[PDB]
Amino acid sequence: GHKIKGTVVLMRKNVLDVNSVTSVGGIIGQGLDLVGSTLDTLTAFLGRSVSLQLISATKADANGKGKLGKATFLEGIITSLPTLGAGQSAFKINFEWDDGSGIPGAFYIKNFMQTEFFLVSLTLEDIPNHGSIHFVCNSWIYNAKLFKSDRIFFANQTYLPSETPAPLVKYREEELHNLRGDGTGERKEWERIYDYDVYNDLGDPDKGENHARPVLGGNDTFPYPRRGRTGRKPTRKDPNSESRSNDVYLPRDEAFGHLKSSDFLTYGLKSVSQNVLPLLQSAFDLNFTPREFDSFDEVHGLYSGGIKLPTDIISKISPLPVLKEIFRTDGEQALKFPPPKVIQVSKSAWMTDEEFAREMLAGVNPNLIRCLKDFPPRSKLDSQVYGDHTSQITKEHLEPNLEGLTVDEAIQNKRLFLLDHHDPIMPYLRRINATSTKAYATRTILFLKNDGTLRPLAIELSLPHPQGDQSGAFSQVFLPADEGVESSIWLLAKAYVVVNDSCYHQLVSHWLNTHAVVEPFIIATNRHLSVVHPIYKLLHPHYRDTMNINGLARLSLVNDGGVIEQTFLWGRYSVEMSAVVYKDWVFTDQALPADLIKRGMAIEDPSCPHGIRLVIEDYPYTVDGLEIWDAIKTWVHEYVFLYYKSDDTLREDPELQACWKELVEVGHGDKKNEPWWPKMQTREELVEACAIIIWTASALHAAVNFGQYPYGGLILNRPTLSRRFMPEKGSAEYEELRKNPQKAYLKTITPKFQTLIDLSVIEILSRHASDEVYLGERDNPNWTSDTRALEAFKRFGNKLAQIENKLSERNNDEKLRNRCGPVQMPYTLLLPSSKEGLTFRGIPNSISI
Ligand SMILES: COc1cc(OO)ccc1O
Numbered sequence: 001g002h003k004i005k006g007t008v009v010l011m012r013k014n015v016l017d018v019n020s021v022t023s024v025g026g027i028i029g030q031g032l033d034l035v036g037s038t039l040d041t042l043t044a045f046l047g048r049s050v051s052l053q054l055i056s057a058t059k060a061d062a063n064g065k066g067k068l069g070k071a072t073f074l075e076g077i078i079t080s081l082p083t084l085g086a087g088q089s090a091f092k093i094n095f096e097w098d099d100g101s102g103i104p105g106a107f108y109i110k111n112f113m114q115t116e117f118f119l120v121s122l123t124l125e126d127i128p129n130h131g132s133i134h135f136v137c138n139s140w141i142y143n144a145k146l147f148k149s150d151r152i153f154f155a156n157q158t159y160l161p162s163e164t165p166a167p168l169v170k171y172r173e174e175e176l177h178n179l180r181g182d183g184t185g186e187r188k189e190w191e192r193i194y195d196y197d198v199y200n201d202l203g204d205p206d207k208g209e210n211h212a213r214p215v216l217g218g219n220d221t222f223p224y225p226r227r228g229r230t231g232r233k234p235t236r237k238d239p240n241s242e243s244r245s246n247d248v249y250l251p252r253d254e255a256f257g258h259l260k261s262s263d264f265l266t267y268g269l270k271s272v273s274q275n276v277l278p279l280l281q282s283a284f285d286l287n288f289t290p291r292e293f294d295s296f297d298e299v300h301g302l303y304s305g306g307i308k309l310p311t312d313i314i315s316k317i318s319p320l321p322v323l324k325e326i327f328r329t330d331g332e333q334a335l336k337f338p339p340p341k342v343i344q345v346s347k348s349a350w351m352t353d354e355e356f357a358r359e360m361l362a363g364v365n366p367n368l369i370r371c372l373k374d375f376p377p378r379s380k381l382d383s384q385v386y387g388d389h390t391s392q393i394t395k396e397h398l399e400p401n402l403e404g405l406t407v408d409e410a411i412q413n414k415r416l417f418l419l420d421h422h423d424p425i426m427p428y429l430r431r432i433n434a435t436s437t438k439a440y441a442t443r444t445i446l447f448l449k450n451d452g453t454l455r456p457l458a459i460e461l462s463l464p465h466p467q468g469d470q471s472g473a474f475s476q477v478f479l480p481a482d483e484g485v486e487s488s489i490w491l492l493a494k495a496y497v498v499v500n501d502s503c504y505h506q507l508v509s510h511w512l513n514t515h516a517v518v519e520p521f522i523i524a525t526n527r528h529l530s531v532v533h534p535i536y537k538l539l540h541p542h543y544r545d546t547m548n549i550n551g552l553a554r555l556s557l558v559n560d561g562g563v564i565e566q567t568f569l570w571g572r573y574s575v576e577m578s579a580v581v582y583k584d585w586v587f588t589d590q591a592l593p594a595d596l597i598k599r600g601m602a603i604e605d606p607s608c609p610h611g612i613r614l615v616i617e618d619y620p621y622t623v624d625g626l627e628i629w630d631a632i633k634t635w636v637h638e639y640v641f642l643y644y645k646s647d648d649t650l651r652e653d654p655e656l657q658a659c660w661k662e663l664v665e666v667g668h669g670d671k672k673n674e675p676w677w678p679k680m681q682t683r684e685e686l687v688e689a690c691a692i693i694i695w696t697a698s699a700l701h702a703a704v705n706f707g708q709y710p711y712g713g714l715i716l717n718r719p720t721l722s723r724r725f726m727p728e729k730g731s732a733e734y735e736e737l738r739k740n741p742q743k744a745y746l747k748t749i750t751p752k753f754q755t756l757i758d759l760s761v762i763e764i765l766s767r768h769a770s771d772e773v774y775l776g777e778r779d780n781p782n783w784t785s786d787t788r789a790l791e792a793f794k795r796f797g798n799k800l801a802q803i804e805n806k807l808s809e810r811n812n813d814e815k816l817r818n819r820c821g822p823v824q825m826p827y828t829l830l831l832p833s834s835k836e837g838l839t840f841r842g843i844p845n846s847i848s849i
């Protein structure tokens with residue numbers, strides 16, 4: 001018949017593996033672009049090492065399964081190739097194919113090498129009038145005897161759940177079945193089995209009672225999204241907890257390798273909590289560095305001279321992989337930190353009222369503020385009088401040197417806003433304040449001034465059960481002052497609000513509303529939508545490395561004695577408190593327009609550009625994100641209506657339906673009966689659902705994760721812990737504010753040790769890897785043969801490229817100063833593209849850090 005020409009592109013384990021790639025990190029992509037040939041070790045793949053077998057998409061055998069044509073082995077290396085690129089090795093392989101064998105549509109691969117490799121692609125240079133077929137793989141191929149079923153890959157062509165090619169139908173449903181792989185057994189590194197399980201692996205019951213943590217999800221007290229199932233043996237002292245392991249399983253392929261050493265961020269983070277944390281505390285349990293800061297100047301010295309420690313420790317936390325890049329130093333005993341953008345221009349601006357309020361709109365947590373409708377603000381808590389009652393905010397003390405409006409008119413004109421942190425911490429406060437932490441539940445009323453700037457009017461510091469629990473809310477309301485002890489008091493007052501905000505942001509805005517919430521969709525997508533499905537291809541890029549970064553969090557971030565419990569206010573009740581907040585989480589309210597309206601920050605107004613009128617126009621996060629959200633909406637809508645002819649073609653889609661059902665009923669199973677879930681019946685419901693998922697994985701996480709060090713790298717500006725209560729007016733504490741307010745501020749906020757852990761961790765989190773795939777229409781190569789989709793994708797990147805310039809001119813507009821503030825820090829967090837490193841910009845396609 002003939003002999004089809006195929007070219008296989010792969011990558012060897014050495015190239016992507018951290019343990020062996022800890023040599024290159026200064027520059028990647030270059031180095032003669034490993035054409036494969038030079039330093040030939042590739043002969044190893046030749047011979048009886050790897051075999052491929054074509055599956056016909058047009059010719060079906062006895063039953064109806066496509067005809068397979070002779071296992072062919074790799075023959076020879078292709079030295080160069082126009083589009084080879086770094087770390088890749090090409091191989092030639094011709095297949096025995098007759099004219100009457102049909103068109104290939106999938107292939108099987110066997111790896112007899114005893115050392116996995118990353119298969120990249122396969123291209124076929126056909127026979128009849130049919131063009132070149134491309135197979136995009138990007139998957140690790142492990143030894144052939146470990147599988148029992150044999151790895152299968154499908155060509156470029158995207159087909160609806162019809163599973164289209166008849167000879168290909170049973171191959172499509174079979175692999176999907178392989179992806180679910182039942183729900184029994186312990187998962188191994190080489191497996192690609194996606195399944196759910198509850199959060200029952202965060203504590204360590206065997207090591208103690210002090211170490212057990214409540215089971216998150218599967219119950220009504222602490223509901224939570226499901227997480228990827230790992231099959232470890234249960235804890236001994238507890239059948240419902242999973243035993244800890246220094247290695248958490250995630251389906252192979254969800255774990256992304258890198259070419260550069262400095263890009264294994266999860267590796268850096270694991271090392272900080274395993275090598276750096278333990279080594280760091282010994283120097284404090286010693287005396288090389290005092291346990292506390294004594295002045296602000298001593299804090300500013302962290303990014304200048306750094307912190308001197310015994311060279312014995314430095315020669316240990318310096319030569320190690322990935323950190324050898326992150327950590328700054330001079331030589332012997334001097335761990336420095338890069339200066340955060342917050343003080344690069346002015347070192348004092350963070351203390352200004354205008355900066356404190358501006359950060360509620362353009363900061364690390366710009367998602368909470370809400371337009372105040374009634375007065376005084378009331379709680380949403382139960383019958384414990386203060387929720388039934390309200391807030392004790394002084395209506396007698398609102399609006400000093402500003403507007404001569406009443407509280408009734410200010411609300412009518414929509415000039416009053418609220419940053420409510422009262423309810424979430426309240427029920428755990430008596431418990432939190434029993435430890436070494438002393439916190440308050442807070443509230444802060446802000447006023448919109450004529451110049452467009454926001455200004456905090458009053459802060460209410462509330463405590464629990466003043467002689468009770470019922471009819472309880474020991475509140476105190478503090479007002480702004482610019483001098484005398486009253487100003488040192490006010491400064492401390494803001495630190496109480498911020499300690500609440502930083503913790504709410506870390507656990508909710510960030511971990512919960514992003515990392516936690518997105519994982520069940522990833523499991524749902526892989527278990528039910530075939531790689532070939534159009535929706536699968538729309539979703540995939542936004543899932544990259546999410547399960548891997550989350551697996552690390554469960555292991556050392558949000559675990560029993562992790563960094564989060566040790567650095568944030570909510571302490572050991574950190575994660576469980578976020579499950580209590582999950583209670584109020586509603587999918588549809590995650591869309592930017594809905595969220596804004598929900599918080600009263602925007603009203604529906606058809607005349608306006610995005611269909612909504614903003615209550616505060618100088619609102620960076622909102623103004624910018626609305627542009628990106630709309631870009632996402634248009635792209636998903638164009639993409640969806642390209643494959644779905646009518647609403648009935650959607651309802652007929654078995655893969656899409658089984659996917660959503662399992663997502664609602666299992667993935668976010670604690671909310672299966674929620675009335676707000678979209679029904680996958682209309683095409684506009686699928687557009688909305690997909691837009692929310694993408695928004696969450698890209699722009700929401702970006703706006704939330706990337707300003708962490710730039711704003712919070714200065715612990716004074718974003719303290720994460722409160723150690724003291726507000727100084728008693730006549731006590732020796734009050735006299736200390738008068739004497740040394742700086743040291744008074746330092747004893748109230750996060751201690752020195754925890755500050756070094758926080759800076760280390762949020763420094764890694766806020767950095768962009770060099771091989772980051774950005775929202776800016778970035779994908780990888782030929783993900784689909786559908787020319788129409790490719791074009792709709794280019795249009796997407798094009799509107800993003802235009803949005804970028806658009807955001808750039810706003811930062812140069814001096815009338816919009818909530819974008820810069822006294823700190824002179826232009827809001828660049830929502831710009832799509834970035835270079836690498838601590839760049840206060842860049843929107844990755846997915847939650848990768
Ligand atoms: C537990 O949640 C977290 C997830 C993170 O991933 O970016 C980082 C810090 C966290 O506290």
Ligand SMILES: [Fe+3]
Pocket residue numbers: 510515701705765847849
């Ligand atoms: Fe993150």
